[PDB]
Design an enzyme around this catalytic site. Structure first.
Site, short mmCIF file in Angstrom:
data_model
loop_
_atom_site.label_atom_id
_atom_site.label_comp_id
_atom_site.label_asym_id
_atom_site.label_seq_id
_atom_site.Cartn_x
_atom_site.Cartn_y
_atom_site.Cartn_z
N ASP A 35 -33.74 13.91 80.09
CA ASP A 35 -34.37 14.43 78.79
C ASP A 35 -34.36 15.76 78.56
OD1 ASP A 35 -35.71 14.36 76.32
OD2 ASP A 35 -37.71 13.83 77.11
N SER A 199 -27.15 24.87 63.77
CA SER A 199 -25.65 24.40 63.42
C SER A 199 -25.38 25.00 62.23
CB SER A 199 -25.54 22.72 62.97
OG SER A 199 -24.28 22.28 62.36
#
Length: 330
Positions: A35, A199
């Site tokens: 994770d 992004s």
């Protein structure tokens, strides 16, 4: 040193991935959910409330000659999906794919919430975010990666998740045969303890690319792709019959649909998520309403590049003095 381990989807939907981990002496092998959105290595154990164990493999520290109670240490964690676990702490030897750390904090669960009990395939979590998020008190503990870093050939790990197929976690090296083209690296902020990056935009299907900054986290422990409501609306508007359902808890679409791809930007590069990766199947057994793999982050407070996005790429988690992320197509 290096390590290399295969990671395997837990079910036919890629809801999560499990990776075998050796703990203790002699080794006890547990299948952990790696994770990159959390920083605790915790396991079902001989200390877990018996009614809360249903098929998981447990760590028994009393059978490990290298286990030592970390005296006074406790832990307690809550995840973004509302699940939680807590307990006490041992140090022990932990190996992943041939890479061994001695003295790793192994957080032994005394209590787990229902969603953990109900998932017999996940024996615990191995956190790979920054150690500043680790929940052990009163002495915060280091992640497996942080402990291994100095010994690694290169201070990196990579995630290569499969679509409906096994993939690989590598530690200490970048397998240049595992991706196509070049790796594009992008800046990371560690201020929230996550692999947080920006992004450069998105496209839906064959549509034109929209240049827009989208701050979010690379999170192998989250199944879906959570993005701003504007982006998610633009995606689902291209699917006939798709709608946001408050009763189901997100966007659903007709199971008869063919989904468009979704592209996200990494600097000047582009990662394409095929439409099939966005199909999470019937909302309930036999339903013709299917659950979407791209959902709004509006209620979360952060955008999350979960498995839906990461499995479309070869992803480098670069833990150099200034961390960065790398993405390549594959």
């Amino acid at each position: 040193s290096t390590g290399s381990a295969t990671t395997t989807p837990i079910d036919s939907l890629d809801d999560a991935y499990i990776t075998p981990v050796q703990i203790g002496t002699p080794a006890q092998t547990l299948n952990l959910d790696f994770d990159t959105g959390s920083s605790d290595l915790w396991v079902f154990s001989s200390e877990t409330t018996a009614s809360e164990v249903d098929g998981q493999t447990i760590y028994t520290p009393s059978k490990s000659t290298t286990a030592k109670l970390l005296s006074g240490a406790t832990w307690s964690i809550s995840y973004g999906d509302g699940s939680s676990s807590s307990g006490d702490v041992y140090t022990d030897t932990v190996s992943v794919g041939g890479l061994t750390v001695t003295g790793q904090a192994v957080e032994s669960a005394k209590k787990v919430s229902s969603s953990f009990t109900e998932d017999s395939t996940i024996d615990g979590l191995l956190g790979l975010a920054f150690s500043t998020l680790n929940t052990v008190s009163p002495t915060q503990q280091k992640t497996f990666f942080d402990n291994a870093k100095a010994s690694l050939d290169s201070p990196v790990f990579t995630a290569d998740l499969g679509y409906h197929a096994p993939g690989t976690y590598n530690f200490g090296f970048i397998d240049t045969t595992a991706y196509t083209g070049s790796i594009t690296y992008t800046a990371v902020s560690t201020k929230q303890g996550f692999w947080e990056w920006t992004s450069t935009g998105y496209a839906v299907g064959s549509g034109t690319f929209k240049s827009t900054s989208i701050d979010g986290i690379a999170d192998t422990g989250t199944t879906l792709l959570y993005l701003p409501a504007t982006v998610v609306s633009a995606y689902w508007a291209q699917v006939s019959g798709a709608k946001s359902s408050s009763s189901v808890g997100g966007y659903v679409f007709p199971c008869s649909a063919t989904l468009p791809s979704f592209t996200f930007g990494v600097g000047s590069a582009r990662i394409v998520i095929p439409g099939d990766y966005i199909d999470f199947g019937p909302i309930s057994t036999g339903s013709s309403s299917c659950f979407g793999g791209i959902q709004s982050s509006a209620g979360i407070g952060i955008n999350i590049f979960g498995d839906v996005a990461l499995k479309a790429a070869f992803v480098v988690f670069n833990g150099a003095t200034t961390p960065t992320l790398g993405f390549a197509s594959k």
